[PDB]
């Protein structure tokens, strides 16, 4: 006997949100932290059709580098503003093409080329620790969309193998032994990975 | 007197607001909470009448402000310098676009002047 | 009495009233005796007809040449004359032992045939005392007249404090100033006031109450010979430095010497012309309203940022608030925002509810109370200002959900650390609360949702929540609407929960039918 | 009408100001009820 009408902050409009939000949550999915009924089961599965359709969604590069170029309205050359913000107009021209790619190898050749001119003698990893988060976002981007379907996904993989991997070698007892050693100095990894194969069946299922 | 809306009315203003964001921290909004609070009641005899929305930092969130207790309703926001997220303007018309809300005080500093 | 004669046959200063008046003033029957004595601005009925010769412009005291034929009637020898009495007053009337303290030998008569019973019980209650019979007044006002009187007869009033609100003759809450009586009429109590006091001699502070009517007749009670705890509701309107004042009285320092004074009196602030009290009677003038509040580390003296002109302070036991305006609406107000505040403070917050809604009943708004107004208000056990049930069980649950997993992690990794392979299943996400409010419990489960999200299982539902969980105890909700505050006393036996200034409280019972082991293993033998 | 009113408002009394420099405790202080203050963590 409850009021469901406030229970309506799940989702947002942002995909942005949308993205790191479902994100958190799923990684806290295979943390452990797994829902133990059939609602649940169900209902982050229809999160993940959110997902999908995201992440066929070309707006994901648009909605991050809008929000970074953002947050740094100062600290900014206006000749490399200007030159990014102009070509990302005519990504945005080019966006819903058959023919449509990131143009981040163009943006890597354009700041390293002032990157090669070099506002020099102060300021250089000054420079680079002002314009970081662009550095490892083109790291993800040079693959494409599903750049991004292989990374994110592989990633998780490997955390489920990781985890389950080192769980069964021998029998439980001893390989829970064998975390006692292979990380004698501490224990919170461990307990989180207890945690997380403890709700395995979830896990399994999903 | 009945509502804010009664107020505006019998008043003779021309716009309802219900929901102010406090663009700012520390003693900037908790001042400005304990004046509008007294003034609610003193109006209204209902503090919570003006619903206020803040912006929690992993940091500020640790260290317990009471600004965020006193607060009415909060939004866990990016940490850091108060550029990556007191300054995001754009980002702040998103939280305000989003609710929606009605108005923004910055009191002083972090974006006064843009 | 005692005390300022060790000191003075020690030269010791004392701060308060000499020897004799203190004694021949603060015996109570001694005291009614001098009120009777001198003009008796309105005293009871059972003392109409007491009085005593002239104590005159000079040194007074208590002599018993007359007072004694006069005295033993007011200490009714039998029935009789105490029914005669009765009849003089006019029922109702009340049978006092005249030697009785702390309440014994205290009986209500509404008419003469209830009278001898409990004539004989009060004489059975202190045997051998005489005992007398006085008016049980009608429902009045009960009101405050500081005084201040120096060594050389000089002796003022300033203002008054109405203390109508009262608890089993307990007074509760305090106001300045009592605008409700008439301005003539207080100043004439006034000057009744001093002339009493002038007439004994007093030498310090003191406080003159009075019993006033809505009709408009007023009845002396008591005087109070010495100081009082709601004493500095005066050093706030009146920009006097009290207790260094009475010391100045200690140390024979005229009145007209003190610089508020002077001030009050609108003279220079470093003069020493004599001031005629009587010809500058009307210059001051109250300045605002204060209201004053009995409140039930250790001593926290309790003001915050919520507002100026308003503090207050609690002891370990009882403390005060006092909340200055420029007006009593303005100062309502400002003692409103204070209590919300001062209110989600925990042991006092359910009593306090109901003193918030009492300040805010339409009664006190209006100044439409008296000393039994509270006494109506009480017997009335109005239980408001009280959280959504369901919000209650949910932040219980969780608190005790909380509570129990810090338990369970702690022991977990404490032990972990310690090395033991325990067993998986301990390490549960798995709540289940059993939680009884009147009667009914609510029965829910709580599933562990995310290092900062907890879900909500309510009887086959599903509501997923989040805390960012704090430091030092607390847990605060937000949703749709807004965000909320919570604070987990937990006892033996019952669930004391907070939810910002509200307070509820939830019991645990099956022990009286059900034998519960609180261990594993076999069952040897009954 | 201010200008026909500028003479009519008056100062009452005077305030002194000072800044100093849980983790935010509005510190009041009991020198004076009408005299009070706090203190962020930073500056009060």
């Known amino acids: 006997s409850l009021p469901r009408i406030q229970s309506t902050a799940l989702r947002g409009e942002k995909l942005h949100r949308v993205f790191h939000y479902v994100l958190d949550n799923l990684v806290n999915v295979m943390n452990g932290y797994c829902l133990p009924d059939p609602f649940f ?77 070099l506002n020099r003698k102060s300021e250089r990893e000054v420079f680079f620790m002002n ?15 599903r750049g991004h379907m292989k990374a994110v996904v592989m990633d998780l993989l490997r955390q489920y193998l990781r985890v389950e991997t080192q769980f069964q070698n021998g029998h439980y007892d001893k390989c829970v032994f064998a975390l006692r050693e292979e990380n004698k100095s501490d224990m919170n990894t461990v307990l989180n990975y207890i945690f997380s194969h403890a709700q395995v069946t979830k896990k399994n299922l999903l | 007197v009945a509502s804010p809306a009664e107020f505006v009315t019998r008043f003779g203003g021309n716009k309802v607001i219900e929901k102010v964001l406090i ?46 207790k006193m607060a009415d309703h909060y939004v866990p926001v990016p940490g850091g310098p108060n550029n990556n997220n007191y300054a995001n303007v754009e980002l702040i018309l998103d939280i305000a676009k989003r609710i929606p809300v009605q108005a923004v005080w910055a009191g002083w500093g972090h974006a006064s002047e843009n | 009495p005692k005390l300022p004669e060790l000191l003075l046959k020690n030269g010791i200063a004392f701060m308060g009233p000499p020897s004799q008046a203190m004694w021949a003033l603060g015996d109570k029957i001694a005291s009614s005796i001098v009120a009777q004595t001198a003009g008796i601005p309105t005293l009871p009925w059972s003392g109409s007809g007491l009085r005593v010769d002239w104590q005159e412009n000079d040194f007074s005291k208590r002599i018993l040449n007359v007072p004694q034929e006069l005295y033993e009637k007011g200490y ?52 051998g005392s005489p005992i007398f019979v006085m008016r049980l007044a009608k429902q009045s006002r009960h009101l405050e007249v500081q005084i201040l009187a120096d060594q050389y007869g000089n002796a003022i009033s300033l203002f008054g404090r109405d203390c109508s609100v009262q608890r089993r003759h307990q007074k509760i809450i305090e106001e300045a100033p009592a605008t409700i009586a008439t301005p003539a009429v207080f100043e004439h ?71 508020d004074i002077r001030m009050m009196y609108g003279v220079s602030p470093w003069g020493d012309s004599p001031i005629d009290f009587e010809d500058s009677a009307h210059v001051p003038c109250p300045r605002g309203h204060v209201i004053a509040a009995r409140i039930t580390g250790t001593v926290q003296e309790l003001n915050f940022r919520s507002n100026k002109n308003v503090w207050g302070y609690f002891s370990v036991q009882f403390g005060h608030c006092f909340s200055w305006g420029e007006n009593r609406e303005e100062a309502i107000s400002n003692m409103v925002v204070a209590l919300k505040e001062l209110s989600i403070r925990g042991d006092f917050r359910t009593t306090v509810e109901y003193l918030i809604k009492l300040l805010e009943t339409e009664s006190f708004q209006m100044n439409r109370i008296d000393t039994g107004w509270l006494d109506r208000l009480i017997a009335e056990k109005v239980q408001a200002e009280r959280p959504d049930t369901m919000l209650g069980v949910v932040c219980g649950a969780l608190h005790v959900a909380d509570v129990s ?78 965000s909320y505050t919570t604070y987990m006393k937990e006892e033996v036996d019952r669930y004391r929960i907070t939810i910002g200034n509200k307070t ?23």
């Open chain 3, 405 to 482: 997993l810090r338990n369970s992690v702690s022991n977990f990794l404490h032990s972990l650390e310690r090395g033991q392979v325990l067993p998986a299943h301990t390490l549960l996400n798995t709540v289940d609360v059993e939680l009884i409010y009147e009667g009914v419990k609510y029965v829910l489960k709580v599933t562990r949702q995310s290092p900062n999200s907890y879900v909500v299982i309510m009887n086959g539902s599903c509501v997923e929540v989040d805390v960012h969980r704090l430091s030092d105890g607390g847990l605060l909700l937000s949703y749709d609407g807004s």
């Open chain 3, 76 to 127: 009714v020898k039998d029935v009789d004359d105490g029914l005669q009495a009765a009849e003089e007053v006019g029922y109702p009337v009340m049978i006092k032992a005249s030697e009785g303290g702390g309440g014994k030998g205290i009986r209500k008569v509404n008419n003469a045939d209830d009278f001898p019973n409990l004539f004989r019980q009060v004489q059975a209650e202190v045997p």
């Open chain 3, 189 to 259: 109590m006034e000057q009744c006031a001093v002339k009493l006091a002038k007439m004994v001699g007093y030498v310090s502070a003191g406080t003159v109450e009075y019993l006033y009517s809505q009709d408009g007749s007023f009845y002396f009670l008591e005087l109070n010979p010495r100081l009082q705890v709601e004493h500095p509701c005066t050093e706030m309107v009146a920009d006097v430095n009290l207790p260094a004042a009475q010391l100045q009285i200690a140390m024979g320092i005229p009145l007209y010497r003190i610089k």
């Open chain 1, 41 to 117: 089961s169900s209902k982050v599965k229809d999160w993940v059709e959110r997902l999908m359709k995201t992440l066929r969604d070309p707006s994901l590069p648009l909605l991050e580098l809008q929000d970074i170029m953002t947050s740094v309205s100062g600290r900014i050359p206006p000749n490399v503003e200007k030159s990014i913000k102009k070509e990302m107009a005519q990504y945005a021209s080019n966006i819903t093409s058959v023919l449509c790619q990131f143009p981040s190898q163009q943006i890597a050749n354009i700041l390293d080329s002032h990157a090669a001119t």
């Open chain 3, 504 to 526: 509820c409280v939830f019991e645990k019972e099956n022990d009286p039918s059900v034998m519960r082991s609180p261990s594993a293993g076999k069952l040897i033998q009954y």
């Open chain 1, 131 to 145: 314009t970081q988060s662009i550095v490892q976002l083109v790291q993800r981007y040079r693959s494409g969309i």
């Open chain 2, 23 to 68: 663009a700012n921290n520390g003693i900037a909004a908790v001042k400005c909470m304990r004046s509008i609070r007294r003034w609610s009641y003193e109006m209204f005899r209902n503090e919570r009448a003006i619903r206020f929305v803040v912006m929690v930092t992993p940091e500020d969130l640790k260290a317990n402000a009471e600004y965020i």
